[PDB]
Amino acid sequence: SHENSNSATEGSTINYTTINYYKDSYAATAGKQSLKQDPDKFANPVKDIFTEMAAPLK
Amino acid sequence: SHENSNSATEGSTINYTTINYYKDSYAATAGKQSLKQDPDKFANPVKDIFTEMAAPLK
Amino acid sequence: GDRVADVIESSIGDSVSRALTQALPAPTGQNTQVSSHRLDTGEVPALQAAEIGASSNTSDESMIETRCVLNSHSTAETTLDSFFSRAGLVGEIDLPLEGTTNPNGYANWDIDITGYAQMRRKVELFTYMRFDAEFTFVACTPTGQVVPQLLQYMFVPPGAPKPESRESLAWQTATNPSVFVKLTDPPAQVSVPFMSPASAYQWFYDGYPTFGEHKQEKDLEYGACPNNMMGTFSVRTVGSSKSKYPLVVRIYMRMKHVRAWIPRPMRNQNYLFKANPNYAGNSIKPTGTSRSAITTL
Amino acid sequence: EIGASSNTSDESMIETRCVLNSHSTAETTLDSFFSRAGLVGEIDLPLEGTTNPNGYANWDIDITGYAQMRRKVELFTYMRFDAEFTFVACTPTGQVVPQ
Amino acid sequence: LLQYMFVPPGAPKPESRESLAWQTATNPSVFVKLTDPPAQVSVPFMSPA
Amino acid sequence: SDRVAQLTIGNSTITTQEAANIIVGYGEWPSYCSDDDATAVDKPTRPDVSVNRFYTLDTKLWEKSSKGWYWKFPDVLTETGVFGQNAQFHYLYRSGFCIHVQCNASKFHQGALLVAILPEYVIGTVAGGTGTEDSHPPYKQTQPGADGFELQHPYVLDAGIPISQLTVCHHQRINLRTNNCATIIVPYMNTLPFDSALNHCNFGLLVVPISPLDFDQGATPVIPITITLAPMCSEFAGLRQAVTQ
Amino acid sequence: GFPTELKPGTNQFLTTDDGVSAPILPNFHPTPCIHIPGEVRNLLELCQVETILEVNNVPTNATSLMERLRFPVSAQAGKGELCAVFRADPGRDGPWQSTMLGQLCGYYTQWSGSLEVTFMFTGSFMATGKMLIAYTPPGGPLPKDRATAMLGTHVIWDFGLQSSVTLVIPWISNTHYRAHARDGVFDYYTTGLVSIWYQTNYVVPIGAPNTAYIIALAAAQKNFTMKLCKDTSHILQTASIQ
Amino acid sequence: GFPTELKPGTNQFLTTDDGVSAPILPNFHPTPCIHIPGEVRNLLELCQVETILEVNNVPTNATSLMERLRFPVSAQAGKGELCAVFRADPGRDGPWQSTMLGQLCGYYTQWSGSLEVTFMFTGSFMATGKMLIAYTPPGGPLPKDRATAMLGTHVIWDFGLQSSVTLVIPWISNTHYRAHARDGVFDYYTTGLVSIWYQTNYVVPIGAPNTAYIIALAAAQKNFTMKLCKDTSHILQTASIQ
Amino acid sequence: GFPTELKPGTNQFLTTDDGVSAPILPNFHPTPCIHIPGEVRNLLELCQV
Amino acid sequence: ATAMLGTHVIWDFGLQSSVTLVIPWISNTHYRAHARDGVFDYYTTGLV
Ligand SMILES: CCCCCCCCCCCCC/C=C\[C@H](O)[C@H](N)CO
Ligand SMILES: CCCCCCCCCCCCC/C=C\[C@H](O)[C@H](N)CO
Secondary structure, eight states: OOOBOOSTTTTOSOOOOOOOSSSBGGGSOOOOOOOOOOTHHHHOOOSSOOOSSSOSOO | OOOBOOSTTTTOSOOOOOOOSSSBGGGSOOOOOOOEEOTHHHHOOBSSOOOSSSOSOO | OOOSHHHHSOOTTOOSOOBSOOOEEOSBOOOBOOOOOOOOSSOOTTEEOGGGSOOOOOOSTTTSOOOOBOOOOBOOSSBHHHHHOSOEEEEEEEEOSSSSSOOSSEEEEEOOSOSSHHHHHHHTTEEEEEEEEEEEEEEEOTTOOOOOBEEEEEEEOTTSOOOOSTTOTTTTOSSSOEEEEETTSOOEEEEEOOOOSSSSEESOOOBOSSOSOOOSTTGGGTTOOTTSOOOEEEEEESSSSOOSSOEEEEEEEEEEEEEEEEEOOOOOSOOOBTTBOOOOSSSOOOSSOOOSOSSOO | OOSOOOOOOSTTTSOBOOOOOOOOOOSSBHHHHHOSOOOOOOOOOOSSSSSOOSSOOOOOOOSOSSHHHHHHHTTSSOOOOOOOOOOOOOOTTOBOOOO | OEEEEOOOTTSOOOOSTTOTTTTOSSSOEEEEOTTSOOOOEEOOOOOOO | OOSOEEEEETTEEEEESSOOOEEEGGGBOOOOOOTTTOOOOBOOBOOSSSSSSOEEEEEEEOOTTOOOEEEEETGGGSSSTTHHHHHHHEEEEEEEEEEEEEOOOOSSOEEEEEEEEEETOOOOOOTTTTTOOOOOOOHHHHSOTTSOEEOSSTTTTTTTOOGGGGGGSEEEEEETTTOSEEEEEEOOOOSSSOBOTTTBOOEEEEEEEEEEEEOOBTBOOOOEEEEEEEEEEEEEEEEOOOOOO | OEEEEEOSSOSEEETTOOOOOEESSTTOOOOOOOOOSOEEOBGGGTSSSOEEOOOOOOOOSSGGGSGGGOEEEEOOOSSOOEEEEEEOOTTSSSGGGGSSHHHHGGGEEEEESOEEEEEEEOSOTTOEEEEEEEEEOTTOOOOSSHHHHTTSEEEEEEOSSSOEEEEEEOOOOSSSSBOOOOSSGGGGGOOOEEEEEEEEEEEOOSSSOSEEEEEEEEEEOTTOEEEEEOOOOSOOOOSOOO | OEEEOOOSSOSEEETTOOOOOOOSSTTOOOOOOOOOSOOOOBGGGTSSSOEEOOOOOOOOSSGGGSGGGOEEEEOOOSSOOEEEEEEOOTTSSSGGGGSSHHHHGGGEEEEESOEEEEEEEOSOTTOEEEEEEEEEOTTOOOOSSHHHHTTSEEEEEEOSSSOEEEEEEOOOOSSSSBOOOOSSGGGGGOOOEEEEEEEEEEEOOSSSOSEEEEEEEEEEOTTOEEEEEOOOOSOOOOSOOO | OOOEEEOSSOSOOOTTOOOOOEESSTTOOOOOOOOOSOOOOOGGGTSOO | OOSTTSSEEEOOOSSSOOOOOOOOOOOSSSSOOOOOSSGGGGGOOOOO
16 A cells, blocks of 8 residues: 555556555556547547538538 | 456356456366256256156157 | 237247256255155056157156165266366477477477367367366476476467468567476466357367368368367477477366367267368277177176 | 548448447457567677677667567557566577576 | 376276376376475375275 | 147148157257347348248158168258248358158057257268278268268267267157157257358258168068258348359 | 475476466457357266167177167067176176266266166067066176076066166165276176066067067166266277377 | 465466566656547557558559559449459458558457448549449359349449448358458358449549549448457568668 | 565475375365274373273 | 148048148138139139
8 A cells, every 4th residue: 555656657547456566556567457448539530520310511 | 356257157157266366267266166957958858748657658 | 110910929039048947956966765665556657768868757766665865975076177177188299309390499289189089089078168278388308308498389379470480570479478488497387268259169060161162172171160270389499599409398288167068979989180080980899898698798 | 521430330221130249348458459578679698709799788778679569569659658578588599507 | 207197996007108098188197397396295085985 | 648749830730649759959949049149230030931831851761771861950951942042142040940750650560760969960981991091071971961861880970979879969769669750849059149051050860770670571661761840940141142052 | 575485296287286377368358158058067967868778799890880789589488588688887898888877987986876777679569578677786696597586676577658668776885986897806896787587478469570679778867976087998099190 | 484385387487477577666756647649548449440441452563552542433334344342351461451450450360340441432523423332241252243242231322412431341240259361261251242333334524534533441330349469460571670 | 476585494395294285186075984983083092991 | 842832731640530731811812713724713722
């Protein structure tokens, strides 16, 4: 419990489930990540979103 | 407690008693199985069951 | 929008598997009850009909005069967990210095556990199997001598590039899993998941994997399930030069979390090939041994 | 032309059935894709020769000398990670020695 | 490297070093190096009586 | 109320006066594929009466020196009816079966047949006899259609596995003193919820005389055996042009 | 620097250790499992199924290997003759090797419980007869006559509608468990003999065939148990697979 | 002197072990992280982006490598001719190697789910036409005519305001997951074919050009998943970097 | 990577150590025990005869 | 093999010496007139 928060994800929205036997958090396991996706960020990056049914160009 | 349910029996009626030091459940021990039998499935697979005393062909 | 009665009263779309059976707990052997003489008509528990295809539902309480026996014998050793969680030889790879098989410091061995008869016949009792595994690599010299040598055990799944030599660039194991060991150290031991695209492996595939006309040219495809081809296990001597210790790696596989479906007749004839239930038709052997007369033992 | 991708489905384009997908998205994480130890360097300490014949060798850290791990990180432009290095020392023949 | 195989009654005894009973598919076996400590296995009460 | 049976499915009907009972294979009735178990998103066609009905393949003659025959499923029904066109026109397939085998003879004939269902009945070869050749069986012999193929070495079922232990699979016995029919109801058996009917065969149907037929001359020497089989709970998916093999 | 001391049993590979090994693949989730029918949960499901006990293990050539699954029943002189005899020892080399019970018991060293033997008459409907199927417990030599065999356990089976009788070979042993008999000292574990005698005769009218056959079908019961898994012995292999 | 016993799996380096290693630097706190845009959290974000599927993989020389990203559409004789055909197998050597889906799937061994193929018309506004884009499931040979191809899945696409249609190649497989097809036994894992046929014709007025081009753009869907990470095979390297 | 340090007394076989060894046979249940008469529980029963 | 595709029964001789085949009503029309040679073959019921 007494250990330095000094990994490269301290200050990230995702929470991990790690094992560590040291005071340095970057020595811990890779753990399990959170399963959260954002495909809209790369695949539909438009200011004015449009639906499936809507023909986009009116 | 935080570990992936990723063994080849996750989704089986039988419950195990395993030991694991990893997050991968397929690394765990073989454990103890449940002692449940179904000999009727191979030995008396008939639509119309008949008793011991009943002569089967009436 | 269902209106006619020929579709309201239907059983189409009934996905629930209707079973006649029910698995009940049998931790111990069945106990025996006390039985007496019966001198009655109508009820005949000894006369059966094997024509039905079922087995005899008779007892010894119905056929002899018995005593109360409390059976405390456990059914825990006939489980698949106990019957299969016993590490057996599934492969054996030689890395000689010279010769004809692998004289160039590396060897690929396509995974089939059907090269040694002792573990094959024990899994070929069933048609479908779904298990995790634990492989174990026992590396040594032909003489059994242990030597100070470093090895690399790479798993090459399907699609991935097989290594053509010892200094090939596939040994870099960036995404492929690999293991490094010294032979002065204990045997390696990794645990493996169920890695097939199907819900179970199957040692017998009655059919062809490819479409198209089936001639004598490509007749060797009969029986090949690609849902069982988990790939290739490669091994080299880690180095830029030729080793001086000949080596033999033996692979010992142990199942865990076993499930199995559809038992089969066990083989009574000798295996001859891998993934092929062929036999010598000239030398057919009975599955037992003989007598000279049926009245004399 | 908008630059976005198709928001279509198979529910909109064919007649489909209810499929309950129980396939996990846990193996496409960066944790799983990159937590696989790969070769990034290789140093030789020969006895004679031209490279390092004097019992020492310096190797400036760049993990861009072997194509298998390079191309896998050069898929991205920025990366922030901890690491775990592992040093597998041996003779050219693979022989292990007391050194 | 040695192999310590337990061959119960009924099971096939090995006739040579390269015999096929050493595959230890159901029989229990132990592999050891002699540079390592002595092996040590625990055993149950295995008699029919 | 057990030796008589009327099997009615579709526009077909089999009456029996000398039955034993009906075997339900592995204690499971045929069924349709759940949404949990399915993976293909296409909506499958479920034709309920045009393919779920009894078909009648051909007759085999039980002579004295008969050795046995096998029929591979669903190769029996790929050139027969509305079933065998949908199987051609589609890529996937899923059905159970109700097999029915008829052999009628007098009360002065005697004999027994074993009628067994062996899943994934892979066929072996004699390896040239010597055991040196890695020969493979032809397509005539692997998938022989509805005219079946006869066994050369029925003790080992032409696969190296013994006939004696075949009663661990489904089976009934046709004892000419006791019965002349054998009804086995088979579910769908595969690792996959769906598979192609033209490449993969799910099981084989073995018919083997364990006891030889015997009669005194004067009687009728011709004793046929007819296989009669119904798909059950059939499903098809993946529609493209028709292909035969 | 947690101090420890390494004990004997280190750096040994025991093939029957139920331990934790290291995974190769992280966050792998396997293909989900569907309902496949025929899930075997215990091998004592397969020991209760009746399979063919080949008593007539006389022939050796290729064509007559189908003769080995049925033993004949002709008409005799009515003097209570002997039809057939066979030992009741499953793991022993004989008729039971042709049975699943006799092949799974090779993978185990000790067995205990009652057995079933089912005989089915494969003759004409007009054929009729009666047979005495006796179980002679241990100590009993081969009986020379039927009056010596009835003293053991027996059934009398009249052919009729139901073509099948079952003889239960009951558990009679000094020991709780019983190992595999063979020649010599391991004769301590014999289960006994089973013998079949003509009670009356095999009676047949004009026209029907004067000879029939009986098919034996052996199994086990709900009280059967096996123990101490080994590697089988009554099947061997010529080396050099492929 | 806590007694222990060392098991197999000791002194081995497995490259895929998620364990604890020893730090070199104590009490090091790294540089804090800022909001950088474009955080990738899963690679199935990059499999849903449409990238160019180069069907016209005919040229080989240097100048005509830009010809390989668009396939032409001229005017025909109206007999329902064939324009183009390509397999629907992403991991297989062909048009999909030019796609991110076809390059990330090389790093995995098994895939499952539906695919998208988007075709965009790059012709004149006065140009008009109709095409049939068929998906022929497995078993289907190469269709010789359009009437054989409509029996599969298909769309009919009329050029107009919206220059783009999408064909969803739906998930039709016996297996839950599907590995990488190739010549021989691994043809069990083929996904099928995709073929494009002139429904009517490519109609054009006076003055406008008598030939156009179509640009294919392939992606995946929200139900797509990959499994069992491996090392890619359809890119190799000549050794001796620098 | 739980750090440990190995102490003296390692890789030694002491014949009088009451420790845990590895089993060869999993899920083996032995033959049950009956009432046999004459159970010796201590050798100071036999020194009084 | 061509005839089983229609409606059928399989009849085993035994105790009950009689089977019945129901020829079911399969017609496009509600009512059906008397067949004969020529145009009135539109009203055939089939074969047995
Ligand atoms: C670091 C090395 C790890 C090696 C892991 C190897 C993975 C093997 C998984 C087990 C596969 C089960 C056996 C395969 C199937 C059958 O034996 C044949 N292919 C079909 O007859
Ligand atoms: C006791 C020895 C410990 C050795 C520790 C080495 C520290 C290395 C930290 C990882 C650095 C990441 C990779 C470096 C950046 C890039 O590869 C290149 N420099 C830029 O192309």
